[PDB]
Amino acid sequence: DVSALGVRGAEHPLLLAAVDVPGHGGAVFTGRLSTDEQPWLAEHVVGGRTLVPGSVLVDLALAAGEDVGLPVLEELVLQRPLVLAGAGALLRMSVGAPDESGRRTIDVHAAEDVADLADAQWSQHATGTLAQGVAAGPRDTEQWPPEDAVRIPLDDHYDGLAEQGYEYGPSFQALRAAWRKDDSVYAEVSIAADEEGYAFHPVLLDAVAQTLSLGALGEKLPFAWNTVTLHASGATSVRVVATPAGADAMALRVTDPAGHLVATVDSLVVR
Amino acid sequence: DVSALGVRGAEHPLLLAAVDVPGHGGAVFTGRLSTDEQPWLAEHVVGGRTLVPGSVLVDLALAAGEDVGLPVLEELVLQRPLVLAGAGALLRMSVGAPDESGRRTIDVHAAEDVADLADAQWSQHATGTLAQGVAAGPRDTEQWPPEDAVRIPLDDHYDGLAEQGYEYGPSFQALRAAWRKDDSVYAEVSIAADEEGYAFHPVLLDAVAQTLSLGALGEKLPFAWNTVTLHASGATSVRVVATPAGADAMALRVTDPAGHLVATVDSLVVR
Ligand SMILES: [Cl-]
Numbered sequence: 001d002v003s004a005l006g007v008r009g010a011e012h013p014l015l016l017a018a019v020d021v022p023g024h025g026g027a028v029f030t031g032r033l034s035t036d037e038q039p040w041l042a043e044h045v046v047g048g049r050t051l052v053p054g055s056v057l058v059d060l061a062l063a064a065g066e067d068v069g070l071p072v073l074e075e076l077v078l079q080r081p082l083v084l085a086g087a088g089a090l091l092r093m094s095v096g097a098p099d100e101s102g103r104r105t106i107d108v109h110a111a112e113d114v115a116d117l118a119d120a121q122w123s124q125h126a127t128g129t130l131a132q133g134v135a136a137g138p139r140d141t142e143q144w145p146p147e148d149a150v151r152i153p154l155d156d157h158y159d160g161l162a163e164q165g166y167e168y169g170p171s172f173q174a175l176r177a178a179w180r181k182d183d184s185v186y187a188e189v190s191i192a193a194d195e196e197g198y199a200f201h202p203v204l205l206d207a208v209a210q211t212l213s214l215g216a217l218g219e220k221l222p223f224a225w226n227t228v229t230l231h232a233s234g235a236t237s238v239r240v241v242a243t244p245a246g247a248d249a250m251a252l253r254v255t256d257p258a259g260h261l262v263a264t265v266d267s268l269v270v271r
Numbered sequence: 272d273v274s275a276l277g278v279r280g281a282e283h284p285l286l287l288a289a290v291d292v293p294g295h296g297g298a299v300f301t302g303r304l305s306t307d308e309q310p311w312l313a314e315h316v317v318g319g320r321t322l323v324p325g326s327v328l329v330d331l332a333l334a335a336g337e338d339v340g341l342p343v344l345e346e347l348v349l350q351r352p353l354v355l356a357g358a359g360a361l362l363r364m365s366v367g368a369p370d371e372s373g374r375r376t377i378d379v380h381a382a383e384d385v386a387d388l389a390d391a392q393w394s395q396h397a398t399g400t401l402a403q404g405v406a407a408g409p410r411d412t413e414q415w416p417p418e419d420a421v422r423i424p425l426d427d428h429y430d431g432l433a434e435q436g437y438e439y440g441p442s443f444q445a446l447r448a449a450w451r452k453d454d455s456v457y458a459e460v461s462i463a464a465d466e467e468g469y470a471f472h473p474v475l476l477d478a479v480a481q482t483l484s485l486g487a488l489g490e491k492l493p494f495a496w497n498t499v500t501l502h503a504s505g506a507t508s509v510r511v512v513a514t515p516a517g518a519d520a521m522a523l524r525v526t527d528p529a530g531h532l533v534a535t536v537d538s539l540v541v542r
């Protein structure tokens with residue numbers, strides 16, 4: 001039925017079809033987001049607007065990279081957040097030709113949902129670069145959290161944020177425990193398993209980025225993700241170490257509860 | 272159902288879906304050819320092989336240009352003819368980003384038919400450039416054929432060609448009358464109406480190119496089409512004036528029987 005239209009079907013929960021560009025090895029991906037299909041979308045509200053979390057675009061870009069064979073998100077810069085309008089949103093990712101180094105540009109567009117794709121009013125929401133896979137470090141066997149780390153009490157964490165206009169519903173309240181040492185933050189982050197097929201579940205990935213609120217940073221929204229590497233897919237329960245990385249940024253190291261490396265982010269920048 | 276997969280449906284008889292690349296204004300088109308659906312494919316046999324006529328790729332490229340908004344085929348260079356293998360063939364056309372002049376590259380690939388598009392063994396069959404539309408000349412009101420033109424008898428034209436290994440079945444025997452003056456050739460060319468939705472019906476367009484066999488050229492296969500402009504779609508009956516255009520090439524001017532301009536080709540080159 002997908003082959004009947006001459007496209008490939010996409011396994012990612014948010015994607016519908018993929019089409020290769022045979023001459024340059026790129027590809028175009030189409031998908032659709034809506035609160036009906038992904039009710040957790042309704043639980044990320046910022047200043048009164050239902051905003052799609054940037055982590056949705058990061059996970060989709062990782063899925064695109066894995067499909068095209070360039071699985072590292074060397075950079076993704078988020079423009080305007082997607083504002084979810086009851087009607088849902090169409091998504092379109094384009095991966096272009098390789099540069100001399102073998103890297104490719106990826107662009108991400110969205111539009112208000114329409115019946116006929118010719119009518120889609122695309123706007124650009126992100127752009128970045130896909131690159132080659134890198135090896136995983138060794139399993140972490142050190143005490144968790146580290147010896148001198150002290151508990152960060154989380155009791156009114158989400159209440160506090162809500163006051164400030166950042167309203168995370170239970171689906172996004174995924175910081176389960178946290179500790180601090182110097183300006184490093186250690187956290188256990190987990191969601192309930194649901195859809196398979198994400199590269200890194202975007203609710204889980206947003207909650208990984210939430211660790212930045214617990215450090216010297218916490219008093220914006222992430223806007224640039226730099227060197228995102230994925231070593232395991234399908235995680236719903238991870239440990240995160242967030243370390244300072246220059247102004248308005250932290251590096252992230254994400255493992256499973258057994259210490260195996262799951263993902264790294266050289267710097268996540270807020271603005 | 273097409274919108275369900277996030278693509279646009281294609282009106283061209285050989286195409287299945289189209290997908291825009293919103294960032295650069297290009298697009299990717301997929302389709303499929305087979306003798307079951309287009310029985311005339313079986314009637315173009317060259318040296319014993321069932322070869323898809325180059326005019327199929329030219330018509331598809333014009334359809335792509337019209338869709339993207341660049342309706343002139345500034346050039347199309349045909350590589351290896353597509354050899355039709357009982358299983359049919361998949362087709363894929365990619366239109367890229369505009370150059371500074373606003374022109375775009377178009378690539379055409381084909382593969383043996385497969386159930387899963389991920390398995391498609393694409394090979395490149397043509398590449399060219401799409402450009403901006405140009406105005407039509409005035410209606411031709413001159414005597415047809417011109418006053419001093421003499422009949423070219425056509426009686427064993429197709430028999431002769433068949434001897435030489437070029438076997439055109441009745442569907443392609445579309446040269447209905449021809450005349451010559453100097454090295455110019457005038458011809459009436461027509462097929463029976465069938466599928467709508469072609470930019471220039473590829474059987475009709477191959478028979479337009481057949482006029483090159485009637486002139487000082489006629490004793491190969493066209494391999495480069497230079498500046499193909501379309502002023503009318505849906506023609507099944509045309510008049511053709513073919514004029515010498517340098518070595519191994521002729522220019523073509525194609526009108527309806529009322530003299531209105533339908534198409535021009537600055538040079539069609541054989542090799
Ligand atoms: Cl494909």
Ligand SMILES: [Cl-]
Pocket residue numbers: 117118277278279289290291
């Ligand atoms: Cl589209």
